[PDB]
Design a protein around this nucleic acid. Structure first.
Ligand SMILES: [Mn+2]
Ligand SMILES: [Mn+2]
Ligand SMILES: [Mn+2]
Ligand SMILES: [Mn+2]
Ligand SMILES: [Mn+2]
Ligand SMILES: [Mn+2]
Ligand SMILES: [Mn+2]
Ligand SMILES: [Mn+2]
Ligand SMILES: [Mn+2]
Ligand SMILES: [Mn+2]
Ligand SMILES: [Mn+2]
Ligand SMILES: [Mn+2]
Ligand SMILES: [Mn+2]
Ligand SMILES: [Mn+2]
Ligand SMILES: [Mn+2]
Lengths: 100, 98, 79, 104, 109, 96, 98, 86
DNA sequence: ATCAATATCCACCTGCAGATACTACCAAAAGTGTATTTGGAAACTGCTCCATCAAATTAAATGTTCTTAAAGGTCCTTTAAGAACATTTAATTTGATGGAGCAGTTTCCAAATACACTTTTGGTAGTATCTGCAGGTGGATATTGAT
DNA sequence: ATCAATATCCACCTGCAGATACTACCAAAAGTGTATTTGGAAACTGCTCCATCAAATTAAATGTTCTTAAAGGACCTTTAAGAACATTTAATTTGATGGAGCAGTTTCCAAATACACTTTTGGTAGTATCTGCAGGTGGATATTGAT
């Protein structure tokens, strides 16, 4: 174990996988396909959080809330994706808030 | 009785409009189109006059700029008449579509 | 009506300013198409900003920011 | 119990919160934000894997590859637009020949 | 007070302000004490170059007051400025006069 | 009844007075210059923001600005701006 | 001897090359080109193996994207043969040049 | 230690190679005049990206260019590329 | 080249919008000065991977011969779009006038941040055995171009 | 609507390169729970400016009628680019070696924040005075297309 410890490089890899097994339980994914898939999550993370960044700022808000993300999403994603994402986003925040 | 060559007023109008900067669409109609369209996203919206004006200024940039590119397309087809296929081609290559 | 409110001569004025000399008959409907698409895209974003800031008035900043994220940045209203 | 589970998501609510703070997108970051964002990213992950999933199978293959991801994206209007200016390494292109080029 | 941070560097633009704008704009946790100085200067320079280029634009057109259309000319003539703002549209700035030479008097001239 | 709408109007003017003291500016055209100044400020501070992030730095220094200016402005314009940038920082630290 | 008519091997090469995803420029030549250019910005650089690969990918991706547009400009002028003017029009409309 | 004079490697991009590209691009017929033109563009492209890539390398005071150096380059270039990190 | 038909460029003039000038108020901003936390530059260096080199192997480039159907050009006809003027249709401009709602201002509390000790887990790492598919094969079927 | 040469198709098999699977360790993360602070929701209210009259006043669009030249189609000649093969150049592959330099770590202060207190001003309102040029004709010269 260890060569003076090389620091931790994280990626959404295990989650991308879990979700792959949720839709396609008999399907794989190469490292090259996983890497791509990993860039896709970061790309969209950034894109959204940057839109939400600007959105708060325009409104003189110092806080990015579920609503900043929500609007960011509807500005960023096209028709149907925006439709379903909003639907999932609201589903999750609801489940989380009244979960205690 | 006077008659000019087909195309000479055109050139007069080009030099004329390229010299000037006034918005070439009549203010009102455009203002109706903005409302009509905006109505589909949220009903009973009020518009700052500046905000409708911003939108016209840009609509106008867009189309002129697009007519430049549309022009270079018709010219490319060894023609001097802009035609839909020119507009469709310029837009395909710009990324609006594809 | 409405989209027809954008007059054949007005489209000509823009082709002229853009340096076009001779114009096909079909260009006008095609241009009417194009602009509506341009307006739908920008106004959708404009209104989103308008909605998000719980306003009932589409201000100019809204329009400005819509145009900025459409990649079509506009100066001289944005303050 | 984790916040991910607490919101009923595979993606990491904990991590997504952290990254939001690390990026300085705003001075404060509410508790709602990382949840929605994980959600949306999970859904999007799911949409694209579904599609490529099927693309893999169409081509008689069980291991998804970047090619399958391209075929997924470029064949789907909305996904193709969102990734409008994105390049999928080793993805190739959709087989497409212009009509006027085919022999007659 | 004693000295404005602006004059200390021979800059008209508000160093002090720019520094503050950087903090509340959420660009990084910390902002170094020389950062805005550099930046203010750069903004001055760029403001200087166009004003200068458009100040000239008002000459060739007889006027002592810069209107929008001057700025347009100032930019769309400078190859390097045209590029920097190739994605910007200036309000009420019209175009640069240009006609494709296959459109001119008697055939392709 | 007072909320400050702080703009670059006067600093534009001070500079206009230097390059061209016999010349004035319409508000239409001044506004354009206020838009220009902010736009560019954003682009550069944004680009600088990314730089420090890429290099896991928590501080934006004069150096980040510099590289950003090189990344953003075209060769010759980037050339002049760097010089004027280094002047300002040097003169400012040379000061009493 | 059996001879194929002009533009059938061509079409066969189109299908062949759209169906696959390998890189079509040779590893080494391309790699030299990178190093040669990178020299004008820095003497004695070093290049991560994957940092080059990253560039070839985008390059080939880009050059294929351009040829598609080029092809639509050729076709626009009732040509089937791309020509330098097509590459230039396409880049002009893209706003890569003028 | 060598570090050879690399000059005009642009000719290493062969006429046959440029063909295969146009082909995947879906181009049936290529003017002989294209090959030079295409060597033009590729050269402009690479210049643009490596210019930016290396600026990042300098900014991190590195002598090695990392794939992230090219990935960020290309991002701010307008040509986002997946699967090489970031 | 002759010449009349408009179009343009030239000077000169002038009313008012839209800049600008002068007072004065002030909250918020820009500085200063003073105690106090911390980011990363210096240094050192483990050890990762990049430059390079040879030799064999293997793949692609090239330069050349033959040909044909693409480009490109001339000369034809078809009819679509400019120029123009006579109407009609619409847009602007004014003036007055409701009252939507954006923006200020003061609450107050749900929800943010803090710094603290507590528990989990994703990644690194090492060691080891699987497995999906390229890639090569043959033999059978579809395509193409000459009939 | 037949023939043959050639490509494309799938079935079947084998090797290895990457994919998966043990295991075991750990720092940074993600959790539970405290204590303090604070954003911005809400509720209000004051007035800026958005909407909408009808009604004179200006300016533009739409329709029509003769007209010309542009678009596109058919024919014909030039040639340049595809197909194919003999020849030769170059890339790639395997394999092993030397060293730069990236990135992991301990350290520690010029330089950051953090905080009160002092001074300054850039924005706003109000009031008024000023002026640069639009838009107005005047009448030489200039361009364009009838002779
Ligand atoms: Mn030049
Ligand atoms: Mn032809
Ligand atoms: Mn020819
Ligand atoms: Mn016809
Ligand atoms: Mn009310
Ligand atoms: Mn685990
Ligand atoms: Mn196979
Ligand atoms: Mn075989
Ligand atoms: Mn068989
Ligand atoms: Mn408060
Ligand atoms: Mn023709
Ligand atoms: Mn060393
Ligand atoms: Mn003052
Ligand atoms: Mn005038
Ligand atoms: Mn007159």
């Amino acid at each position: 174990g260890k060569k003076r410890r090389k620091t931790r490089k994280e990626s959404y890899a295990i989650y991308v996988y879990k979700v792959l097994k949720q839709v396609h339980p008999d399907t794989g994914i190469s490292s090259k396909a996983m890497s791509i898939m990993n860039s896709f999550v970061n790309d969209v993370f950034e894109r959204i959080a940057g839109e939400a960044s600007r959105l708060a700022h325009y409104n003189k808000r110092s806080t990015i809330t579920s609503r900043e993300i929500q609007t960011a999403v509807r500005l960023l994603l096209p028709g149907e994706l925006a439709k379903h994402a909003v639907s999932e986003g609201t589903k999750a925040v609801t489940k989380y808030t009244s979960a205690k | 009785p006077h008659r000019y060559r087909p195309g000479t007023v055109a050139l007069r109008e080009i030099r004329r409009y390229q010299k000037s900067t006034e918005l070439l669409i009549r203010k009102l109609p455009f203002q109706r189109l903005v409302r009509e369209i905006a109505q589909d996203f949220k009903t009973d919206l009020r518009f700052q006059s500046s905000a409708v004006m911003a939108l016209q200024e840009a609509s106008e940039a867009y189309l002129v700029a697009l007519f430049e590119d549309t022009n270079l397309c018709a010219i490319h087809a060894k023609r001097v008449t802009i035609m839909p296929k020119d507009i469709q081609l310029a837009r395909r290559i710009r990324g609006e579509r594809a | 009506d409405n989209i027809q409110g954008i007059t054949k001569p007005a489209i000509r004025r823009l082709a002229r300013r853009g340096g076009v000399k001779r114009i096909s008959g079909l260009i006008y409907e095609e241009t009417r198409g194009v602009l509506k698409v341009f307006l739908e895209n920008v106004i959708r974003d404009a209104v989103t900003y308008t909605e998000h800031a719980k306003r009932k008035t589409v201000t100019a900043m809204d329009v400005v920011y819509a145009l900025k994220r459409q990649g079509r940045t506009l100066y001289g209203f944005g303050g | 119990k984790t916040r991910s589970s607490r919101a009923g998501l595979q993606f990491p609510v904990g991590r997504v919160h952290r990254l939001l703070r690390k990026g300085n997108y705003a001075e404060r970051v509410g508790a709602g934000a990382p949840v929605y964002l994980a959600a949306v990213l999970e859904y999007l992950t799911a949409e694209i894997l579904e599609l490529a999933g099927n693309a893999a199978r169409d081509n008689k293959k069980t291991r998804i590859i970047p090619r399958h991801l391209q075929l997924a994206v470029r064949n789907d209007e909305e996904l193709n637009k969102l990734l409008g200016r994105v390049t999928i390494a080793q993805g190739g292109v959709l087989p497409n020949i212009q009509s006027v080029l085919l022999p007659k």
